Amino acid sequence: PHMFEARLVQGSILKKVLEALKDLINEACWDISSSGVNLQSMDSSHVSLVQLTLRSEGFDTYRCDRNLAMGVNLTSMSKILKCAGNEDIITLRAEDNADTLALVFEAPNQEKVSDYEMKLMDLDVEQLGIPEQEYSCVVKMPSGEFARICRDLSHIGDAVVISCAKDGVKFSASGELGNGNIKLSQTSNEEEAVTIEMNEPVQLTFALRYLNFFTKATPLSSTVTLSMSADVPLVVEYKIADMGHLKYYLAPKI
Amino acid sequence: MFEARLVQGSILKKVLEALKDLINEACWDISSSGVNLQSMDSSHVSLVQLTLRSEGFDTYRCDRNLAMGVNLTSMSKILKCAGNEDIITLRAEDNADTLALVFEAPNQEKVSDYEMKLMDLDVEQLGIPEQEYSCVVKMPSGEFARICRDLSHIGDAVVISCAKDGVKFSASGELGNGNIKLSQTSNEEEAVTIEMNEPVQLTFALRYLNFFTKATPLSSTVTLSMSADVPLVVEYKIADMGHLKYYLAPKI
Amino acid sequence: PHMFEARLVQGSILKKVLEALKDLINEACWDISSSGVNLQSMDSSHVSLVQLTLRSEGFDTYRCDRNLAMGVNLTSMSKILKCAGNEDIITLRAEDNADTLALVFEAPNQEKVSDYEMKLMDLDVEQLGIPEQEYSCVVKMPSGEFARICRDLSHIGDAVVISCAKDGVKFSASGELGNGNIKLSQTEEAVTIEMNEPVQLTFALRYLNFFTKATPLSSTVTLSMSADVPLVVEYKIADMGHLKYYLAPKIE
Amino acid sequence: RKRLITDSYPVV
Amino acid sequence: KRLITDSYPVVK
Amino acid sequence: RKRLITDSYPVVK
């Protein structure tokens, strides 16, 4: 009794989720309930926050008797998920007062099963709360294009200015080599679209080194959404299959 | 005059890549019956044994048996100058300080000749009695390499447990522990087959198993032979011409 | 108004040019005129020289109303051109009222436009005149083959002896491991030899392996040789011009 | 110094 | 630590 | 001493 178990057929979702977290967040609390898996954590600088949601429905079987909170070293967990093949069925199992998580990997079409037992840890955890927000500008664009832009501008400077207007969205940086602007225009013609919805024009400045951690989520989705308003953190959102999302929040520079 | 022509030159490339990280230098015993090489690693925890029989060669001549002391890093660098579809010829004289390697590009007018300097070696040779092992596992080489790679993220040693129905590989460390269970398949070279006499459980250093898996490209299957308190044998067959056997002493 | 503007639909040419220069030359002067873009620089040792020609007529649009000499850090420019896609169309432009080079990259059919402004620098450089001359031996060969030969022999020694005769060309090196010779017979996939007289010269392989970084610009390379004179290694940039490297022969 | 996430979205 | 020579002695 | 490009090609500028 008081036992969590969840079976995910696309084990690679979970491998990719941990590669998209482990370099930004060392260790976090996984909040498990009957609605699903929730994770919320600031990086140690408190400049950025990550929000992961995986709904119960995404799992091929899912049981959560009692709510629980597992403290996980994300680096430890990423190392264990590297022993899963990309098409393994992955089961997570935990007892409600347990010091360990069990991970079972079933190789598809093959009599091979792997079992790992990972030690948990106890974790102090601030609870942040983000309210409902109307964003002055929302940009949907290919995830590969955003990853390219953040990588390329990081060779020009440490900071990017993001401007949204009617024409479209512009990304700018400058440094000791010179200056760069990249302009994406709204696409007239599904995945390849750049879509801008804006109420008021916005211009914010952000640290490129954090954006380059966010784009480690690029394998989870072929698109990304950027949401911006004049005095508040940027949101960068990647959708995960049809079962949830990974959201990155980043405080603007000054 | 020793001269051996191998049309599938990629076999020799693969054999040097399988040896050069485990062994620095070794004596090549060359005779009418083929090429043999035996060598412990510098720590004496492992031994490798290679045979390439004269019959696997497209052409083979050996007028008098030779012993050629070779720096395997040096021969490995020279064989990287050969293409994967090159015909490779080895040539030596009785009284030569030097092994000649000739690489013929198969569908091109290109020929490479290298002269490799030999060295003076004196080797500890071991006598290994033929024996009947308690457990002999045959499995896919890719699977074994993958198991050894994955478990070395968990610990430095692997416990290999062999029973009638399957083989289990286990490791423990600061993260936690892990167990990988392969069942005997009743259903090719994706088979997992086991000949048992007694169950056996032994522990081995993953550092050495990971060196042995550099042989994976020579064969789609590998065999593990195990008995209590006796070294593991890991064997890769080479085409029709011989084998690479690796021995590893169990841990304390 | 823009006093220099050049639009290049095959922008990947400029990406490849900068990858072929930046490891050999740190900073160079781009000489821009109404007939095109020229660059010449010796490496810091003065043992080699590079000469680039891009003719105004190979650009899809080209305008230049005065001679410019733009001093460029080729590592900075390389970093900027890595922000261009391989299918992008690249415009270079310089206004008289600036001391920057502007680059514009247009993805085609996708509306993404990038503009960079690159800081220039002041460079006082000596220019060398190349005596027009005919060569004892001219070898035309696949660029990938040449790159492969220079790479392999650099694991054997630091100098290559190039022997050329009517029938073929030989490349030789010697070092602590032993020695090696690669022989190519006369046959895009061809090896052709125009020879007036046999030549035998020695060159430093370290420099040849900087030169072969231009391999992506062309499927063929041309080697021109005569006694006592620098080797010329030439990559044609189809529909535009060429990149030529010169290397002084090595003594003892 | 730096603007922080907690400057817009405080702890609860 | 156990060595190969503990099972198969050197012999020449 | 080492052979240089300048041993064959004149300065012109």
PDB file of C-alpha atoms in Angstrom, chain A residues 10-253:
ATOM      1  CA  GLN A  10       8.362   5.940 -25.172  1.00  0.00           C
ATOM      2  CA  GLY A  11      11.235   5.807 -22.693  1.00  0.00           C
ATOM      3  CA  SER A  12      13.140   8.374 -24.726  1.00  0.00           C
ATOM      4  CA  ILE A  13      10.738  11.093 -23.500  1.00  0.00           C
ATOM      5  CA  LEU A  14      12.158  10.611 -20.056  1.00  0.00           C
ATOM      6  CA  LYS A  15      15.827  10.434 -21.259  1.00  0.00           C
ATOM      7  CA  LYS A  16      15.338  13.711 -23.136  1.00  0.00           C
ATOM      8  CA  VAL A  17      13.581  15.406 -20.223  1.00  0.00           C
ATOM      9  CA  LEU A  18      16.534  14.675 -17.899  1.00  0.00           C
ATOM     10  CA  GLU A  19      19.202  15.849 -20.433  1.00  0.00           C
ATOM     11  CA  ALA A  20      17.107  19.064 -20.745  1.00  0.00           C
ATOM     12  CA  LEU A  21      17.267  19.634 -16.925  1.00  0.00           C
ATOM     13  CA  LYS A  22      20.467  18.173 -15.489  1.00  0.00           C
ATOM     14  CA  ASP A  23      22.870  20.971 -16.508  1.00  0.00           C
ATOM     15  CA  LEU A  24      20.550  23.774 -15.229  1.00  0.00           C
ATOM     16  CA  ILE A  25      19.180  22.095 -12.046  1.00  0.00           C
ATOM     17  CA  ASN A  26      21.417  19.778  -9.959  1.00  0.00           C
ATOM     18  CA  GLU A  27      18.679  18.280  -7.845  1.00  0.00           C
ATOM     19  CA  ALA A  28      14.948  18.720  -7.556  1.00  0.00           C
ATOM     20  CA  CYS A  29      11.773  17.567  -5.904  1.00  0.00           C
ATOM     21  CA  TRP A  30       9.522  15.469  -8.125  1.00  0.00           C
ATOM     22  CA  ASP A  31       5.959  16.106  -6.936  1.00  0.00           C
ATOM     23  CA  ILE A  32       3.990  12.941  -7.757  1.00  0.00           C
ATOM     24  CA  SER A  33       0.198  12.800  -7.503  1.00  0.00           C
ATOM     25  CA  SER A  34      -2.727  11.061  -9.285  1.00  0.00           C
ATOM     26  CA  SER A  35      -2.863  13.863 -11.877  1.00  0.00           C
ATOM     27  CA  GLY A  36       0.792  13.228 -12.825  1.00  0.00           C
ATOM     28  CA  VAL A  37       4.375  14.316 -12.278  1.00  0.00           C
ATOM     29  CA  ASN A  38       5.186  17.958 -11.492  1.00  0.00           C
ATOM     30  CA  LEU A  39       8.633  19.560 -11.002  1.00  0.00           C
ATOM     31  CA  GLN A  40       9.392  23.209 -10.167  1.00  0.00           C
ATOM     32  CA  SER A  41      12.848  24.589  -9.406  1.00  0.00           C
ATOM     33  CA  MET A  42      15.033  27.662  -9.694  1.00  0.00           C
ATOM     34  CA  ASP A  43      18.648  27.354 -10.761  1.00  0.00           C
ATOM     35  CA  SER A  44      21.083  28.212  -7.930  1.00  0.00           C
ATOM     36  CA  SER A  45      21.417  31.852  -9.171  1.00  0.00           C
ATOM     37  CA  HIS A  46      17.562  32.423  -8.896  1.00  0.00           C
ATOM     38  CA  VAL A  47      17.758  34.039 -12.339  1.00  0.00           C
ATOM     39  CA  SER A  48      15.774  31.163 -13.964  1.00  0.00           C
ATOM     40  CA  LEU A  49      13.080  28.685 -13.107  1.00  0.00           C
ATOM     41  CA  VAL A  50      12.030  25.420 -14.783  1.00  0.00           C
ATOM     42  CA  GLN A  51       8.474  23.994 -14.737  1.00  0.00           C
ATOM     43  CA  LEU A  52       7.865  20.382 -15.919  1.00  0.00           C
ATOM     44  CA  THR A  53       4.444  18.743 -16.138  1.00  0.00           C
ATOM     45  CA  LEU A  54       3.821  15.096 -17.201  1.00  0.00           C
ATOM     46  CA  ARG A  55       0.139  14.130 -17.012  1.00  0.00           C
ATOM     47  CA  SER A  56      -1.039  10.703 -15.717  1.00  0.00           C
ATOM     48  CA  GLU A  57      -2.712  10.129 -19.149  1.00  0.00           C
ATOM     49  CA  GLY A  58       0.645  10.059 -20.948  1.00  0.00           C
ATOM     50  CA  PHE A  59       1.711   6.924 -19.165  1.00  0.00           C
ATOM     51  CA  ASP A  60       0.575   3.617 -20.493  1.00  0.00           C
ATOM     52  CA  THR A  61      -0.176   2.557 -16.890  1.00  0.00           C
ATOM     53  CA  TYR A  62      -0.107   4.903 -13.901  1.00  0.00           C
ATOM     54  CA  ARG A  63      -0.823   4.413 -10.219  1.00  0.00           C
ATOM     55  CA  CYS A  64      -0.411   6.923  -7.392  1.00  0.00           C
ATOM     56  CA  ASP A  65      -2.102   5.895  -4.094  1.00  0.00           C
ATOM     57  CA  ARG A  66      -0.856   8.789  -1.962  1.00  0.00           C
ATOM     58  CA  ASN A  67       0.836  12.067  -3.027  1.00  0.00           C
ATOM     59  CA  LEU A  68       4.604  12.069  -2.581  1.00  0.00           C
ATOM     60  CA  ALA A  69       7.685  14.145  -3.096  1.00  0.00           C
ATOM     61  CA  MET A  70      10.950  12.469  -4.209  1.00  0.00           C
ATOM     62  CA  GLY A  71      14.238  14.319  -3.852  1.00  0.00           C
ATOM     63  CA  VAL A  72      16.374  13.373  -6.888  1.00  0.00           C
ATOM     64  CA  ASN A  73      19.923  14.195  -7.884  1.00  0.00           C
ATOM     65  CA  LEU A  74      19.215  14.910 -11.564  1.00  0.00           C
ATOM     66  CA  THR A  75      22.797  14.020 -12.582  1.00  0.00           C
ATOM     67  CA  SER A  76      22.498  10.585 -10.908  1.00  0.00           C
ATOM     68  CA  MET A  77      19.172  10.006 -12.597  1.00  0.00           C
ATOM     69  CA  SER A  78      20.518  11.080 -16.077  1.00  0.00           C
ATOM     70  CA  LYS A  79      23.404   8.622 -15.692  1.00  0.00           C
ATOM     71  CA  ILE A  80      20.968   5.749 -14.990  1.00  0.00           C
ATOM     72  CA  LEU A  81      18.676   6.759 -17.911  1.00  0.00           C
ATOM     73  CA  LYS A  82      21.697   6.550 -20.231  1.00  0.00           C
ATOM     74  CA  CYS A  83      21.546   2.750 -19.636  1.00  0.00           C
ATOM     75  CA  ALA A  84      18.072   2.814 -21.293  1.00  0.00           C
ATOM     76  CA  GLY A  85      17.806   2.336 -25.035  1.00  0.00           C
ATOM     77  CA  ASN A  86      15.875   4.923 -26.982  1.00  0.00           C
ATOM     78  CA  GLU A  87      12.914   2.541 -27.547  1.00  0.00           C
ATOM     79  CA  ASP A  88      12.887   0.845 -24.101  1.00  0.00           C
ATOM     80  CA  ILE A  89       9.683   0.776 -22.098  1.00  0.00           C
ATOM     81  CA  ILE A  90      10.533   2.554 -18.859  1.00  0.00           C
ATOM     82  CA  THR A  91       8.742   1.893 -15.547  1.00  0.00           C
ATOM     83  CA  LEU A  92       9.287   4.015 -12.435  1.00  0.00           C
ATOM     84  CA  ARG A  93       8.381   2.526  -9.030  1.00  0.00           C
ATOM     85  CA  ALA A  94       8.560   3.985  -5.487  1.00  0.00           C
ATOM     86  CA  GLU A  95       7.170   3.079  -2.003  1.00  0.00           C
ATOM     87  CA  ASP A  96       5.647   6.106  -0.119  1.00  0.00           C
ATOM     88  CA  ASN A  97       8.308   6.283   2.593  1.00  0.00           C
ATOM     89  CA  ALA A  98      11.235   4.928   0.584  1.00  0.00           C
ATOM     90  CA  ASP A  99      14.800   6.124   0.271  1.00  0.00           C
ATOM     91  CA  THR A 100      15.031   4.725  -3.326  1.00  0.00           C
ATOM     92  CA  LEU A 101      13.423   4.920  -6.793  1.00  0.00           C
ATOM     93  CA  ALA A 102      13.344   1.793  -8.969  1.00  0.00           C
ATOM     94  CA  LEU A 103      13.757   2.163 -12.752  1.00  0.00           C
ATOM     95  CA  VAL A 104      12.987  -0.840 -14.943  1.00  0.00           C
ATOM     96  CA  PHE A 105      13.939  -0.862 -18.633  1.00  0.00           C
ATOM     97  CA  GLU A 106      12.347  -3.394 -20.957  1.00  0.00           C
ATOM     98  CA  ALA A 107      14.008  -3.757 -24.320  1.00  0.00           C
ATOM     99  CA  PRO A 108      11.397  -4.027 -27.036  1.00  0.00           C
ATOM    100  CA  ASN A 109      10.941  -7.392 -28.841  1.00  0.00           C
ATOM    101  CA  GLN A 110      13.721  -8.960 -26.685  1.00  0.00           C
ATOM    102  CA  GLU A 111      14.175 -10.946 -23.484  1.00  0.00           C
ATOM    103  CA  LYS A 112      16.261  -8.286 -21.793  1.00  0.00           C
ATOM    104  CA  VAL A 113      15.249  -6.399 -18.666  1.00  0.00           C
ATOM    105  CA  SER A 114      17.337  -3.960 -16.674  1.00  0.00           C
ATOM    106  CA  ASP A 115      16.580  -2.894 -13.049  1.00  0.00           C
ATOM    107  CA  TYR A 116      18.216   0.104 -11.356  1.00  0.00           C
ATOM    108  CA  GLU A 117      17.804   1.340  -7.822  1.00  0.00           C
ATOM    109  CA  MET A 118      18.636   4.998  -7.307  1.00  0.00           C
ATOM    110  CA  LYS A 119      19.107   6.522  -3.864  1.00  0.00           C
ATOM    111  CA  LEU A 120      16.905   9.562  -3.134  1.00  0.00           C
ATOM    112  CA  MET A 121      17.925  12.563  -0.991  1.00  0.00           C
ATOM    113  CA  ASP A 122      15.991  14.929   1.364  1.00  0.00           C
ATOM    114  CA  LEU A 123      15.570  18.430  -0.061  1.00  0.00           C
ATOM    115  CA  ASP A 124      14.682  21.873   1.253  1.00  0.00           C
ATOM    116  CA  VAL A 125      12.435  23.479  -1.359  1.00  0.00           C
ATOM    117  CA  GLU A 126      11.123  27.039  -1.753  1.00  0.00           C
ATOM    118  CA  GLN A 127       7.693  26.993  -3.397  1.00  0.00           C
ATOM    119  CA  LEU A 128       7.374  29.719  -6.007  1.00  0.00           C
ATOM    120  CA  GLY A 129       4.059  30.560  -7.495  1.00  0.00           C
ATOM    121  CA  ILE A 130       3.529  31.941 -10.929  1.00  0.00           C
ATOM    122  CA  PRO A 131       0.147  33.520 -11.541  1.00  0.00           C
ATOM    123  CA  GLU A 132      -1.821  33.707 -14.756  1.00  0.00           C
ATOM    124  CA  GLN A 133      -0.152  36.185 -17.078  1.00  0.00           C
ATOM    125  CA  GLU A 134      -1.233  37.946 -20.233  1.00  0.00           C
ATOM    126  CA  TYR A 135       1.801  38.177 -22.537  1.00  0.00           C
ATOM    127  CA  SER A 136       2.239  41.256 -24.805  1.00  0.00           C
ATOM    128  CA  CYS A 137       3.932  39.069 -27.457  1.00  0.00           C
ATOM    129  CA  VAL A 138       3.891  35.338 -28.108  1.00  0.00           C
ATOM    130  CA  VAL A 139       6.180  33.849 -30.833  1.00  0.00           C
ATOM    131  CA  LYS A 140       5.865  30.233 -32.083  1.00  0.00           C
ATOM    132  CA  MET A 141       8.826  29.120 -34.219  1.00  0.00           C
ATOM    133  CA  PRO A 142      10.829  26.001 -35.033  1.00  0.00           C
ATOM    134  CA  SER A 143      12.864  24.815 -32.012  1.00  0.00           C
ATOM    135  CA  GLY A 144      15.930  24.152 -34.222  1.00  0.00           C
ATOM    136  CA  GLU A 145      15.858  27.775 -35.426  1.00  0.00           C
ATOM    137  CA  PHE A 146      15.760  29.121 -31.856  1.00  0.00           C
ATOM    138  CA  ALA A 147      18.657  26.806 -30.771  1.00  0.00           C
ATOM    139  CA  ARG A 148      20.677  28.044 -33.821  1.00  0.00           C
ATOM    140  CA  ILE A 149      20.000  31.696 -33.094  1.00  0.00           C
ATOM    141  CA  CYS A 150      20.996  31.460 -29.384  1.00  0.00           C
ATOM    142  CA  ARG A 151      24.205  29.507 -30.278  1.00  0.00           C
ATOM    143  CA  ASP A 152      25.197  31.878 -33.118  1.00  0.00           C
ATOM    144  CA  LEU A 153      24.525  35.088 -31.128  1.00  0.00           C
ATOM    145  CA  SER A 154      26.474  33.732 -28.156  1.00  0.00           C
ATOM    146  CA  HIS A 155      29.698  34.044 -30.292  1.00  0.00           C
ATOM    147  CA  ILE A 156      28.902  37.793 -30.659  1.00  0.00           C
ATOM    148  CA  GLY A 157      27.979  38.745 -27.081  1.00  0.00           C
ATOM    149  CA  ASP A 158      26.704  37.517 -23.700  1.00  0.00           C
ATOM    150  CA  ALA A 159      23.321  39.264 -24.000  1.00  0.00           C
ATOM    151  CA  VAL A 160      20.511  39.160 -26.547  1.00  0.00           C
ATOM    152  CA  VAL A 161      17.912  41.916 -27.116  1.00  0.00           C
ATOM    153  CA  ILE A 162      14.608  40.383 -28.309  1.00  0.00           C
ATOM    154  CA  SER A 163      12.279  42.868 -30.053  1.00  0.00           C
ATOM    155  CA  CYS A 164       8.775  42.020 -31.344  1.00  0.00           C
ATOM    156  CA  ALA A 165       6.930  44.194 -33.853  1.00  0.00           C
ATOM    157  CA  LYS A 166       4.526  43.873 -36.865  1.00  0.00           C
ATOM    158  CA  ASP A 167       7.255  42.818 -39.366  1.00  0.00           C
ATOM    159  CA  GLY A 168       8.210  40.094 -36.862  1.00  0.00           C
ATOM    160  CA  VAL A 169      10.781  39.247 -34.208  1.00  0.00           C
ATOM    161  CA  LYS A 170      14.396  40.420 -34.063  1.00  0.00           C
ATOM    162  CA  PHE A 171      17.313  39.067 -31.930  1.00  0.00           C
ATOM    163  CA  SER A 172      20.355  41.328 -31.432  1.00  0.00           C
ATOM    164  CA  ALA A 173      23.755  41.122 -29.733  1.00  0.00           C
ATOM    165  CA  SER A 174      27.042  42.988 -29.778  1.00  0.00           C
ATOM    166  CA  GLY A 175      30.548  42.506 -28.429  1.00  0.00           C
ATOM    167  CA  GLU A 176      34.227  42.846 -29.224  1.00  0.00           C
ATOM    168  CA  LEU A 177      33.889  41.287 -32.808  1.00  0.00           C
ATOM    169  CA  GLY A 178      31.065  43.682 -33.813  1.00  0.00           C
ATOM    170  CA  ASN A 179      27.229  43.501 -33.864  1.00  0.00           C
ATOM    171  CA  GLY A 180      24.549  41.084 -35.112  1.00  0.00           C
ATOM    172  CA  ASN A 181      20.779  41.213 -35.693  1.00  0.00           C
ATOM    173  CA  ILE A 182      18.697  38.298 -36.763  1.00  0.00           C
ATOM    174  CA  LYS A 183      15.182  39.066 -38.079  1.00  0.00           C
ATOM    175  CA  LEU A 184      12.473  36.311 -38.395  1.00  0.00           C
ATOM    176  CA  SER A 185       9.385  37.340 -40.321  1.00  0.00           C
ATOM    177  CA  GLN A 186       5.921  35.915 -39.935  1.00  0.00           C
ATOM    178  CA  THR A 187       5.638  33.027 -42.470  1.00  0.00           C
ATOM    179  CA  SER A 188       3.071  33.192 -45.279  1.00  0.00           C
ATOM    180  CA  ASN A 189       2.416  29.674 -46.667  1.00  0.00           C
ATOM    181  CA  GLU A 190       3.034  23.292 -40.346  1.00  0.00           C
ATOM    182  CA  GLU A 191       6.103  22.951 -38.097  1.00  0.00           C
ATOM    183  CA  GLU A 192       8.211  25.406 -40.194  1.00  0.00           C
ATOM    184  CA  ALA A 193       5.887  28.331 -39.398  1.00  0.00           C
ATOM    185  CA  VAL A 194       6.881  31.402 -37.526  1.00  0.00           C
ATOM    186  CA  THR A 195       3.751  32.865 -35.923  1.00  0.00           C
ATOM    187  CA  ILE A 196       3.582  36.119 -33.989  1.00  0.00           C
ATOM    188  CA  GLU A 197       0.698  37.263 -31.884  1.00  0.00           C
ATOM    189  CA  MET A 198       1.283  40.601 -30.214  1.00  0.00           C
ATOM    190  CA  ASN A 199      -0.816  43.108 -28.398  1.00  0.00           C
ATOM    191  CA  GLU A 200       1.947  45.667 -27.662  1.00  0.00           C
ATOM    192  CA  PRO A 201       5.538  45.812 -29.028  1.00  0.00           C
ATOM    193  CA  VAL A 202       8.148  44.621 -26.520  1.00  0.00           C
ATOM    194  CA  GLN A 203      11.945  44.817 -26.169  1.00  0.00           C
ATOM    195  CA  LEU A 204      13.833  42.864 -23.417  1.00  0.00           C
ATOM    196  CA  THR A 205      17.416  41.837 -22.792  1.00  0.00           C
ATOM    197  CA  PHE A 206      18.406  38.328 -21.539  1.00  0.00           C
ATOM    198  CA  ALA A 207      21.566  36.370 -20.684  1.00  0.00           C
ATOM    199  CA  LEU A 208      22.465  34.087 -23.579  1.00  0.00           C
ATOM    200  CA  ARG A 209      24.218  31.535 -21.372  1.00  0.00           C
ATOM    201  CA  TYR A 210      20.821  30.595 -19.815  1.00  0.00           C
ATOM    202  CA  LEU A 211      19.016  30.447 -23.136  1.00  0.00           C
ATOM    203  CA  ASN A 212      21.712  27.981 -24.296  1.00  0.00           C
ATOM    204  CA  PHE A 213      20.809  25.671 -21.312  1.00  0.00           C
ATOM    205  CA  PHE A 214      17.074  25.942 -22.210  1.00  0.00           C
ATOM    206  CA  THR A 215      17.722  24.806 -25.798  1.00  0.00           C
ATOM    207  CA  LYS A 216      18.970  21.405 -24.496  1.00  0.00           C
ATOM    208  CA  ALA A 217      15.169  20.649 -24.543  1.00  0.00           C
ATOM    209  CA  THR A 218      15.205  20.984 -28.381  1.00  0.00           C
ATOM    210  CA  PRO A 219      14.840  17.175 -28.873  1.00  0.00           C
ATOM    211  CA  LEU A 220      11.437  17.142 -27.052  1.00  0.00           C
ATOM    212  CA  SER A 221       9.653  19.141 -29.697  1.00  0.00           C
ATOM    213  CA  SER A 222       9.958  20.514 -33.201  1.00  0.00           C
ATOM    214  CA  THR A 223       8.535  23.912 -32.027  1.00  0.00           C
ATOM    215  CA  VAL A 224       9.035  26.387 -29.214  1.00  0.00           C
ATOM    216  CA  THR A 225       6.972  29.283 -27.918  1.00  0.00           C
ATOM    217  CA  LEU A 226       8.467  32.439 -26.495  1.00  0.00           C
ATOM    218  CA  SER A 227       6.227  34.662 -24.333  1.00  0.00           C
ATOM    219  CA  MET A 228       7.244  38.153 -23.352  1.00  0.00           C
ATOM    220  CA  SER A 229       5.941  41.242 -21.500  1.00  0.00           C
ATOM    221  CA  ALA A 230       7.716  44.478 -20.598  1.00  0.00           C
ATOM    222  CA  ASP A 231       8.735  43.846 -16.982  1.00  0.00           C
ATOM    223  CA  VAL A 232       8.505  40.103 -16.452  1.00  0.00           C
ATOM    224  CA  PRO A 233      10.531  36.946 -17.072  1.00  0.00           C
ATOM    225  CA  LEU A 234      10.649  35.443 -20.546  1.00  0.00           C
ATOM    226  CA  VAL A 235       8.881  32.065 -20.876  1.00  0.00           C
ATOM    227  CA  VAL A 236      10.306  29.491 -23.237  1.00  0.00           C
ATOM    228  CA  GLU A 237       7.948  26.503 -23.619  1.00  0.00           C
ATOM    229  CA  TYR A 238       8.520  23.093 -25.242  1.00  0.00           C
ATOM    230  CA  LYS A 239       5.568  20.603 -25.551  1.00  0.00           C
ATOM    231  CA  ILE A 240       6.261  17.026 -24.619  1.00  0.00           C
ATOM    232  CA  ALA A 241       4.493  14.450 -26.862  1.00  0.00           C
ATOM    233  CA  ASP A 242       0.848  14.978 -25.972  1.00  0.00           C
ATOM    234  CA  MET A 243       1.354  14.581 -22.251  1.00  0.00           C
ATOM    235  CA  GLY A 244       2.773  17.873 -20.920  1.00  0.00           C
ATOM    236  CA  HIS A 245       5.424  20.530 -21.212  1.00  0.00           C
ATOM    237  CA  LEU A 246       8.732  21.948 -20.070  1.00  0.00           C
ATOM    238  CA  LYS A 247       8.673  25.673 -19.397  1.00  0.00           C
ATOM    239  CA  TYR A 248      11.721  27.819 -18.739  1.00  0.00           C
ATOM    240  CA  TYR A 249      11.348  31.222 -17.075  1.00  0.00           C
ATOM    241  CA  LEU A 250      14.190  33.765 -17.264  1.00  0.00           C
ATOM    242  CA  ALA A 251      14.454  37.106 -15.511  1.00  0.00           C
ATOM    243  CA  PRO A 252      15.411  40.036 -17.777  1.00  0.00           C
ATOM    244  CA  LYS A 253      18.850  41.766 -17.497  1.00  0.00           C
TER     245      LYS A 253
END
